[PDB]
Structures are given as C-alpha cells and as structure tokens.
Amino acid sequence: AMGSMERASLIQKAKLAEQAERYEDMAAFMKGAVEKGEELSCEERNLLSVAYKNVVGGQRAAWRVLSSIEQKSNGPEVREYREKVETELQGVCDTVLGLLDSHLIKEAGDAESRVFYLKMKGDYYRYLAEVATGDDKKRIIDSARSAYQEAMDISKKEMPPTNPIRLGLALNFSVFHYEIANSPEEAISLAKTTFDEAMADLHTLSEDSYKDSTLIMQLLRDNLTLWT
C-alpha cells in the first residue's frame, strides 16, 4: 500500500504522524517501512512499537468499555459492537505479528534487536489473550509465554540487568504472569528480582542511563505496590 513511497519518507512521515497524534497513520507508515525488507535501527524499532502500541491500546480501552457494558447487560447490539471492536483489535495484532514473523525476528541477530522484537511478539499475543475465549485460547497464552521466555533467556545472557529493554521485557512479562497466566506469585517474584538486580547495577551507569533504568524500576515498584 505504501509500496511506492521511499523508505526514508515513510520514516519521516511516521515521526510527523506521532507529533500530530495520528497513530493509525504512524502505524501504516511504519508497516510500509518494515515491508521495504531492510532491518530497522534502534530509533525505527521504537517508532514501530510506539505506533502499534498506541493503536492497539486505544482498541483495548474501547473493548474494555464495551465488555463491561455487555457483562452488566447479561438486543444483540452491545455484543455485536464489542465483537466488531474485538475483530479489529485481533486484525491489528495479527498484522504486527505478521511483520515480526516476516521477517523482522529472523533477521535480528544482535541481542538488542532480537529481544526487542520477541518482547513485542509476547505483547501482541498477550493482547490477543486478553480477548480470547475459544479452542485456541490456551495456545495463544502459550505463544505469548514462549516469546517472552526466549526474550528473557537472551536478555539474561547478553544484557546488563539495568538495560532498559531487559527491564521493560521483565515488566511486561510480569504483567503477563499476573493478568493472563493467573500466576501472581510468579509476577511478584519476577518484578522483585528484576528490581533488585537493577538496583545493584545502577552504580555503573551514566546520568542518562540511570534515568532510563530508574524510570522502569519505578513502574516495577508501582506494580509491586498494587499487587502486594
């Protein structure tokens, strides 16, 4: 669809779309950029993630509103409209997963890129799991688990405990354990051990790296306070 636009122009327009808070456009520009077939830089990976996280985040919030109304109600309209939003959400998740599978993950050899993409894979299966009810729901949960686990294994071997991607991965995998997998103790354990191991490595960091690591540590702490 964006096949006729230059890669650099798609990236530029994704940055403009973010500034304009046009996240659907942003996501379309970034999908076009990925489909050029070249690997993404650090900055470009963040544009891709920001775009789709915002699009699906809005769909999730709408699905939650509609699901609440539907549950209180229990004509067909609320269920029909919740189903419409759900199908759209699933479509976006499938699109992101398709970009990761064709071919971002397989071409990502550096630990930072590969962990980034596997964290995304876990997240979009997690979003699918939030709305799943059918014969494949266990399998969707396991797909999220498997992606997060591979990312964790690489991160623990290849990155310091304060690395922001490693920290964000652990944060999100802990949310998976608490909210999806019905494993609140695993969630609490992961968040605690992540926080403590990062704390012990902060002394190695510059001011700017310290700010990033402590920002995510505070999110881990905020969850621990909510969960305990």
């Binding site: 963040n46 999110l219 969850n223």
Partner: peptide, 9 residues
C-alpha cells in the same frame, strides 16, 4: 497493572 509505555513520557 501497568506495562511499559511507548515513550519515556
């Protein structure tokens, strides 16, 4: 609870 935001803000 909360997952990571897309940007530091």
């Amino acid at each position: 609870a909360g997952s990571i935001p897309g940007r530091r803000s």
